[PDB]
Amino acid sequence: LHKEPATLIKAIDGNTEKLMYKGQPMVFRELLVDIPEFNEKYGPEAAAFTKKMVENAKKIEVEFDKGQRTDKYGRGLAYIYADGKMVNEALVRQGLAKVAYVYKGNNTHEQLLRKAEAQAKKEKLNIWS
Ligand SMILES: Cc1cn([C@H]2C[C@H](OP(=O)(O)O)[C@@H](COP(=O)(O)O)O2)c(=O)[nH]c1=O
Numbered sequence: 001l002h003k004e005p006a007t008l009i010k011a012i013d014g015n016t017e018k019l020m021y022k023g024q025p026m027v028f029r030e031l032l033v034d035i036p037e038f039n040e041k042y043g044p045e046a047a048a049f050t051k052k053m054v055e056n057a058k059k060i061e062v063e064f065d066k067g068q069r070t071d072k073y074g075r076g077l078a079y080i081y082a083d084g085k086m087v088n089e090a091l092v093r094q095g096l097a098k099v100a101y102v103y104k105g106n107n108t109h110e111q112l113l114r115k116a117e118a119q120a121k122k123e124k125l126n127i128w129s
Contacts, residue, residue, distance in 0.1 A: 003061035003081055008054060016054060021062060021076060030074040030088045031065060032113050034100030034114060042126050046096040053090060057082035067105030079109060092116040095126030 006019040006028075018025040035050075036043040054060060062078040071077055080087040088109070091097035093116035102110055121128045 001063050001065065001079075003063045006060050006062050007077065008060060009049065015051060015083055019060065019062065019076075019080075027073075027075045028062060028078055028080060029071060029073075030091075030097075030112060031077050031079055031106055032099055032102060033088050033091060033097040035091060035097040042096055046091060049094060049096055050087065053082050053087055055086075056078075061101070065106040066109045067103070078107060089113055089116050093120055094124070095120035095128045098127060 004021070006021045009018045009020050009025055011017040017027065019028050020026075021028075034124040035046050036046060038047060059082075061081040061084075062076065063081065064076075064078050068079060086109070088097070089112060092099060097109050098111070099113045099117050120126070
């Protein structure tokens with residue numbers, strides 16, 4: 001796998017809906033996680049943690065896995081990094097997302113993320129409280 005550059009695109013409301021990848025706006029869906037929606041418990045917290053992590057970062061990178069790069073809704077499927085720290089792993093490690101959607105061939109970081117989830121669960125953090 002290899003990391004590639006992207007930048008945040010700031011939406012009219014001040015948040016990031018899309019990343020600019022090879023100079024095109026794209027919604028990216030994080031690989032291997034289920035993140036609660038805003039209306040669900042921990043949803044506001046997951047969103048706020050993501051916003052701080054990506055906005056504070058000097059460098060955003062995306063990393064496609066070995067399988068499908070876009071899903072059925074046209075979203076890019078990747079691991080997202082903020083100054084070299086994976087956003088997908090960080091949400092899981094904080095109990096702000098669960099490991100999920102593990103499909104054949106896009107599963108490279110599965111064990112790493114399950115390791116993070118077990119720690120968040122052992123620590124009874126957030127979703128696991
Ligand atoms: C994470 C991921 C989601 N998806 C699709 C599966 C779900 O389809 P369905 O909408 O039919 O349930 C949807 C979940 O995304 P969200 O959790 O963003 O809603 O995204 C993929 O196809 N590949 C993936 O790797």
